[PDB]
Amino acid sequence: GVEIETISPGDGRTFPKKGQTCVVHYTGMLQNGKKFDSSRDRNKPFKFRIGKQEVIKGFEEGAAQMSLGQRAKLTCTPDVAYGATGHPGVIPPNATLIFDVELLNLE
C-alpha cells in the first residue's frame, strides 16, 4: 500500500539490496499537511539496517524501491504504517504518512 514519486533524480541503477545499511535524510508529514518529523532538523543522517525490521514495513518497502541519490515522495497507508494503534503521543491511529525521503548515501 505504498506509492513512490521521483523528486530529485540520482543514479537509478544501484538499488539498495540486503547487506548495506541505508543512510537517508527524510522529512515526515501528516496527511492533512502538518510537519512533525525530519532529519535535517536534527542535522544528522538517519542510518537504518534494512531487513532487520527496525522501521515500519511501508517505509522499508519504499526504501527498497528507491535508488541512490533519488529523492522520493513516499506514502505509507495505515496498514503498512502504525495503523489502528498509532505511535503514542506523536501520530494518531489510522492516518496515511507522507515522507520526503532522500537516500543521500549507501555507506
Binding site: 501528516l30 502538518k34 512533525f36 498509532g86 505511535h87 503514542p88 503521543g89 506523536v90 501520530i91 494518531p92
Partner: protein
Amino acid sequence: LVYYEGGAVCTHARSLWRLEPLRISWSGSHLRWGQPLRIRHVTTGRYLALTEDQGLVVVDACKAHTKATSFCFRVSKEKLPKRDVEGMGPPEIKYGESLCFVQHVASGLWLTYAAPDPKALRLGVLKKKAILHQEGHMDDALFLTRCQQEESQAARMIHSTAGLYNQFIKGLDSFSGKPRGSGPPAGPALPIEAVILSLQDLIGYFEPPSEELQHEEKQSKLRSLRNRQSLFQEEGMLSLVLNCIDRLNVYTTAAHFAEYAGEEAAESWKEIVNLLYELLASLIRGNRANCALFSTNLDWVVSKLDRLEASSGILEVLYCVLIESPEVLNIIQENHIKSIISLLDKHGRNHKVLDVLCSLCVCNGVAVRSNQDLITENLLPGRE
C-alpha cells in the same frame, strides 16, 4: 441525645454550650451555685430537657416549659436559693478549675454517663450516653473552658444560615415539578434577597488574606480561615450547599427556571449560582481535609463542567480541588480528561484550563504517569 466524647470531635462546633438564665435584666451577672439557668446548644438552638420517653434529650425552644429545662450548679451532692440582684454579683466560679455538679433542680436528679457498653462500644469510639441519674456516680465533675470569641461568633451563623437554606430547598423542591405556565407560583415566596445578602456576607467572610500583608499576619489569618472552613464542613454546610447547586441545576436556562418558580425570581438565578460556586471555592481553598471530600463524588462536578451560566467559578473550584488533593488525581479516569479537553475546545483558548492540566500532571511533587500519558495521548497527536 447528649454524649460524652473525647478527642478532636469537641474542638468542633457541636460542643458549645450557652448558659442562659431566667432573668431578662442582668442576665450577664456572675453565676451562683444552685440558681436556675437553661442550657442551650448554639448550632441547634435547642435546650436540655427531661423528656418522658427518651430520658434526657434536647427539646425545641417552643416546648422549653422551664420545668424540664432548668438546671443548677453546685460544688457537692448534698441536699440544701438567694434572690436575684440587679447588679454584677459576687465572683464564684473559675475557668479551668472549680469542678461543678449540675443538677436538674425540678427533678432533683444528676447527669451521669450510662455505665453499660454494648458490642458497638466494645472496640469502637468511646462515647458515653449521659443520662439524668437519680444519684449518679462520683467522677462526673465537669470543667468549664472558654472558646474564643471568633468561633463563638462563627457558630451562630451556622444555625441562622442553615435554616435559611432549609427554607430555600423546601421552596425549590416544592416547585421542582408543576409548571406555573402563566399563572401564580407554587406556594410561599422564597427569601431570595436575604439569601443573596447571606452569600455576599459569607464570601467576604471567607476571603483569603491579601499578599501585601506581613508574613506572620497572613499566617494568623490562615489559622482562623482553616479553623472556620473545617467548622462549617463539620456542621455540614458543604452538604447543604451541594444540595443547593443540585436543586438549582435542574434548569438549563433562566426562562425554563421561570416556568416553575416565577418571572420575578428568574433574574437572580445566574447570580445565586455564581455566588454558590464562589462560596464553595472559598470553602475548599487551602484545606486538605475539606478538599478530600470530593473523591467520593468527583463525577458530580464533571457532570456540571459543561454548563454555561456559571462556568468560570466551577472551573476555579476544580482548580482548587486538584491543586490540593493528590488522591483526586488517583481517582481521575479517561472520561474526565475528555471533559476538560472538550472545555478547551468549547471555551476558546482559556489559559486557566492549561493550569488545570498542569495540576493534573504533578501534585505535591509526585508524578502521576497514569494521567500524564492520557493528557499527551488525547491532546498532542492531533495538533489542532
